[PDB]
From a paper:
For clarity, we choose to predominantly focus our discussion on the higher resolution 1.98 Å structure (State-1). The two confirmations are highly similar (RMSD: 0.22 Å) with the most notable differences occurring in the β-sheet of the N-terminal domain of CbbL, in particular the conformations of loops P37-D42 and G115-G125. The sharp turn of the backbone introduced by P22 (the first observed residue of the bound peptide) ensures that the upstream peptide chain points outward toward the solvent instead of clashing with CbbL. The side chain of R23 forms a salt bridge with D99 (CbbLA) and hydrogen bonds to the hydroxyl groups of the CbbL subunits Y72 (CbbLA) and S345 (CbbLB) as well as to the carbonyl of G362 (CbbLB). The L24 amide and L26 carbonyl hydrogen bond to the carbonyl of CbbS Y96 and amide of CbbLB F346, respectively.
To ensure efficient CO2 fixation, cyanobacteria and many autotrophic proteobacteria concentrate CO2 in the carboxysome, a bacterial organelle encapsulating Rubisco and carbonic anhydrase within a protein shell. Here, we explore the encapsulation mechanism of the carbonic anhydrase, CsoSCA, and demonstrate that it is incorporated into the α-carboxysome via a carbonic anhydrase–Rubisco complex. The cryo-EM structure of Rubisco in complex with this peptide reveals that CsoSCA binds Rubisco at a site overlapping with that of the scaffolding protein CsoS2.
Author numbering:
A (entry chain A), D (entry chain A), G (entry chain A): 3 to 457
B (entry chain B): 4 to 110
C (entry chain C), E (entry chain C), H (entry chain C), I (entry chain C): 22 to 30
F (entry chain A): 97 to 289
The structure:
């Protein structure tokens, strides 16, 4: 358009470009639109493209001051949703110039800011986002990544083992350290603060960090293996968050943890840069993901949140446990684990991967499994996740009949037996019981652990 | 297209046509109905943006008669014929003004 | 891992 | 329990306390549980209580180190959902000791961390949270609040008027300032950066702040009214966010804006404290709310997010427009506006208010309306929102046939005419057309504005 | 506003 | 002997004299009537940051007692209304106005808002009267960091005078504030709550 | 290679990949190799590829610790040099992972570190480097660029006019300001410190900045046009350089200058970031370029140095004057001016452009012309450079018979007359004399200026 | 200038 | 001590 004509106009006239070929620099988004009957697909797609980028509900003269053809987001492909005729996939291209470089915040705000509120759609689901390599290079990414972390902690050949201290709340700092000490001395690589553990009247953070570090060092001396505890630095303000991170560095804590959604992307990105500058590993908890990621018709798929975390920065990311998930959602889970860890993920619709995602040199992130998992889950966990994973057994350790040290040893024996059997070429999931039963003959801890919880 | 003419404004209601006596009266009545205490402020035109205008006497705490308020406005105007004059309504529950608007623009 | 399955490969 | 017995136990035995009377210090939560057939209500409620607070999937000995009776969260009341037999309301009490003081992050993380992921429930909806006065006093709250803001800006007697510059993206800094200058000189109190406007190649933030401040000062001199523009300080990192806020203060900008969900609670809380320390007004945009708040069966109701914003801190909060909302959702909207602005909100189930919410002295927040609103909406907007509101007309200003200055004047005349008519005792919504038509006889700008968009 | 509708009132 | 006391420390001398003798069961009552501070000790103490003559020169006030007013009610006024009261008092011929001793930073009136409106009131009255004006901004605060922050803001906005409660705020805070006042040219009014 | 065999090996076996297709992320380099008779082309190309990237003169076992196939630089194409049979073009691809992100230093060091010292080649000339968009986005680039600079200085419609104060050395600070004042009041947009002017006994920098700023402000008030003087912040140390830049900002100087080659890339890049953070325009002088760029058989072509400057950062770059250059080198000069200013420069061998260079959104840089130029050069200068240029007349201003003010006015009239004639559609170079003669009839200053120097 | 001759165009 | 004799108990 070259002349200014005021009034309301249809989004399709400008934001639906079926013949557009996305550039390599473009950010691409796949939205699953469940529109209200009566609204046209192209118009729904164009409306999402316009409102997420440069469009307005009515024509504004200021558009003529700039070149909307260059800047505008454009819907370029419509596809059916397999097996769901109420919904369709809209593919929208966004010029890279629309986004602040190195800002997952800005890109996220633009894509999810207000399109989710449209009365035209019954539901809007952001399925996938193609971050071009040019954008990826502007982002800090994981402060260390899988390989650097293994070198720093001198851990090779197996998944790492972790435990969340339980109960989630209520323990004093000294008792918290006692629980940490017992878990670590028994064979866990890591222990962690619960996501809810920040600084509470029952346990102030500085007291917690001191006792935990004492526990970590004592266990490390007594086992001859490196140990860590993810100290939660999630805090009310950035100043408080950095203060806690600095104290962890000062006392020699190798790893800290943060809640990137609840704490927020701005805080997380700053923390990730701080972690890289100070050599501290960063474990990321995904609290609130289920609020946003569960509903298949409305929200954001976790795979998108996974990509944002890798760009924002974390050395570990909580990924849930595939054991609970059904086979339909298993392939999707394997999909985002590849996104978390691999360098190049090719497009694969069966796994929910709508775009080729190139990470280039950006390091991979440890996948973290947790939940109500215990020794019996070990074979399936080792199979699904592989070596570059952290398996966290909170209840499965502190709930052992003989205490944390025995529970840790039971999990450690189960893990090592599964790994040894895998390396020998056995099908660990098929032979899981036999493997665990054989290992239990040499470990009373594993034996009673297998009796405590059911297969 | 018409060109928009820039001019100085006077906050609430200044974008509407200047108020006759009836419109001004309705606003004061509304303020009293809310339980707010009407008051009058005045200032030299150049100082219009100052936080603290001159206060005319004291706020008319508990005033229920709009005519008394209007008479005070005239008395302030007579004393300071070049000043802008602003009606305010103190809300002691919020410790804020419930309404404020310029009745005379000054100079 | 890492370099084994790059886009170039 | 006094002795340690390992193994899995039912949540009901500990976390369902039907006879509990909540203390005044307790945080209370109302969840709408849509459970999977076969699961018992009490067990579902207890499971939510346990996992959100101190519970574990299996018995841990460390529970005996502390007093779980004191610390535990407890479900205390089950109620039916009116007209929905698939769902029930669970009321859970949380002892105040469970939470970091002054941390909306911590409270939010605890309540929404992992209960939303239960396979037992089809959906989980956090409807309301009772923040006790004792907790409220630990939070910073709005840096200024409605009354202080009106005193600072010397604005009384009417809703404030705002405009978002359009197109959302694509304008250079100097052109951005031109648009801001024209809107402000025409009678708008405020203009704002779009939520997506941070620092982009087409317009770097420092250049934007300089030209906008020049525009704001020029318009202020030419109108004799105080003016502001909400400069977006949303940034990749806290360091960047504070840098931009400091520059806004340095150049004399009265107000800034932040995206509290996408930017994150930690960043927002720190910014709110900074704003109070530096005398800068804070406008809060709610990008991503629709991702979390739209679905009535799964997610968090906006009223909860409203309470968190007031505690975290903002002088203005975007609240959408009730004009679009249906009457069923109108009362709910009026409910959270009271929560945003009032000191004491009594319990009212018809409005979705499940608990008495006492704010004490904590200041109220300006409610902000925006969207595809234009002059014709003015009567209903003034009626619904009242004086302590900001009405933002982005397209309704920059889309005027005669440009920003005329569009601003048209909106300003419409607003003042509606306010004058309301003060005179007319029913502005019933007589809206007549009021607007009468005002248009003296304002050519309003007249053609009323012709541009439909009634 | 603010103090008008407090819990005490 | 003078050697018993930290130099320049009213705290130390005061603590030593009144620390525990007042609790003796031997006495029904103990009243400290007077203390002779030797000149040698006096010289170690900072003393008033300015004093009568320097203050009169700074404020250009001579020939009469100065006139002040405490804003009333002691509590309850918003910052803008507080400034209005200050403005009216100052324009009418008072040299000074002051915060009440209880006015620090309250929900009804945060300190930074108060300092801004009061300074605006002070400057407006000064222009309209042709006489120097001041308002004793209360910097009494929960912590020394907070106290200094408020004092620095008063200096930054051009407030000539501040006030402190030396007994309730405490001698350590007061002595530090008095040294700060001398270093920054701010007059210090002391309330004896 | 999979096994370790010690000893010297030929570079061709590994570093010559004739069938390689460069990736989009690859940095590409074109070297003109003039080899010593007896050495094979492919071996010479491979040797340059190996030594510039990962190769060694002898086989090292550590190669087997990593994947040399991924990391290695590779020569992929050999081409003849048109009209020169002694030399050939070697095209080498470098994986982006080889370089520190955002570091022109690192990329430059790798390409030019030690290959230029080979005894195998008589000469080595780096002709062009393809910086991929992914790398470009990691670099800061110009702090402002052409469009932002024009908006900041409110200058539109013509090339800017500058003058270097003469004599280069010897003037006191107050006399320096007098010369600056006279030039600026007479119609020059800018004046500048000589490249040699830093802080000398005859004129300390702080005294110079004070008097110059006074001169700039006085001239600005007396002309009603914005004025600037490029204060040289080139200093012995980074601390000194930043100190001078900060003082220029403190006193309100809009623009500063730096020598990026002699001062160095590290200092320049830091200064460019500082300039962006503080809103100060940055003029870049290219002292030493002739040492490196003149020799057609050995060295680095200026086009490469131009690309590095744009990535490192500068708002203006000295580009010499095409008037002296012959037509063979004129097209080359027009080539790097496009590289300096354009967004996308397509490959064009006639202009010396060996690769498509995409700058994306990275702003363009003002081209600066200077030398022994005077009024008579104006028509050709306006034709060749166009509007987004700075024409600097040092001797052509201070050498006017009537002093700086008249000399400035003469240049300003000549420039405006050439621009007006160009806009009217006249061929300014063909009609240059007639245009200048016509303008001189109304300007005595231009008239005698045209008499002082020859056509 | 700038956007007129982009790679996309 | 501490939690044994709380207001709630």
């Amino acid at each position: 358009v070259k002349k200014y004509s005021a009034g309301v106009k249809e989004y399709r006239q400008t934001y639906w470009m079926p013949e557009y070929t996305p550039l390599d620099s473009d950010i691409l988004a796949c939205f699953k639109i469940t529109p209200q009957p009566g609204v046209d697909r192209e118009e729904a797609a164009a409306a999402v493209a316009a409102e997420s980028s440069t469009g307005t509900w009515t024509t504004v003269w200021t558009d003529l001051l700039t070149d909307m053809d260059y800047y505008k987001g454009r819907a370029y492909r419509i596809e059916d949703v397999p097996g769901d005729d109420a919904a369709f996939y809209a593919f929208i291209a966004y010029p890279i110039d629309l986004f602040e470089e190195g800002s997952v915040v800005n890109v996220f705000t633009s894509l999810v800011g207000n399109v989710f509120g449209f009365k035209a759609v019954r539901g809007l689901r952001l399925e996938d986002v193609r971050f071009p390599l040019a954008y990826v290079k502007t982002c800090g990414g994981p402060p260390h990544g899988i390989q650097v972390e293994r070198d720093k902690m001198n851990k090779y050949g197996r998944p790492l083992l972790g435990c969340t201290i339980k109960p989630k709340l209520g323990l004093s700092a000294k008792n918290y350290g006692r629980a940490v000490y017992e878990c670590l001395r028994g064979g866990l690589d890591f222990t962690k603060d619960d996501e809810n553990i920040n600084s509470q009247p029952f346990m102030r953070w500085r007291d917690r960090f001191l006792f935990v570090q004492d526990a970590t060092e004592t266990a490390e001396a007594q086992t001859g293996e490196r140990k860590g505890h993810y100290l939660n630095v999630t805090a009310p303000t950035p100043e408080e968050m950095y203060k806690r991170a600095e104290f962890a560095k000062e006392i020699g804590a190798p790893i800290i943890m943060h809640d990137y959604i609840t704490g927020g992307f701005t805080a997380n990105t700053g923390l990730a840069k701080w972690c890289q500058d100070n050599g501290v590993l960063l474990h990321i908890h995904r609290a609130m993901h289920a609020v946003i990621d569960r509903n298949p018709n409305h929200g954001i798929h976790f795979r998108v949140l996974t990509k944002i975390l890798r760009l924002s920065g974390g050395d570990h990311l909580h990924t849930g446990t595939v054991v609970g998930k059904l086979e339909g959602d298993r392939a999707s889970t394997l999909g985002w684990i590849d996104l978390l860890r691999e360098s190049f993920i090719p497009e694969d619709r069966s796994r929910g991967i709508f775009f080729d995602q190139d990470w280039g040199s950006m390091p991979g992130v440890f996948a973290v499994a947790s939940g109500g998992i215990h020794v019996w889950h070990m074979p399936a966990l080792v199979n699904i996740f592989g070596d570059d994973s952290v398996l966290q057994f909170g209840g499965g350790t502190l709930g052992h009949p003989w205490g944390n040290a025995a529970g840790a040893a039971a999990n450690r024996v189960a893990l090592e037996a599964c790994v040894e059997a895998r390396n020998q070429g056995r099908d660990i999931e098929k032979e899981g019981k036999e493997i665990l039963t054989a290992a239990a003959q040499h470990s009373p801890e594993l034996k009673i652990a297998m009796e405590t919880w059911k297969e | 297209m018409q060109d928009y003419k820039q001019s100085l404004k006077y906050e609430t209601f200044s974008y509407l046509p200047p108020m006759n006596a009836e419109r001004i009266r309705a606003q004061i009545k509304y303020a009293i109905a809310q339980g707010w205490s009407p008051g009058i402020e005045h200032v030299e035109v150049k100082n219009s943006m100052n936080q603290y205008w001159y206060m005319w006497k004291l706020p008319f705490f508990g005033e229920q008669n709009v005519d008394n308020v209007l008479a005070e406005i005239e008395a302030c105007r007579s004393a300071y014929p070049t000043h802008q004059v602003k009606l305010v309504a103190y809300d002691n529950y919020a410790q804020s003004l419930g309404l404020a608007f310029v009745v005379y623009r000054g100079n | 891992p890492r370099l084994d399955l790059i886009e170039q490969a």
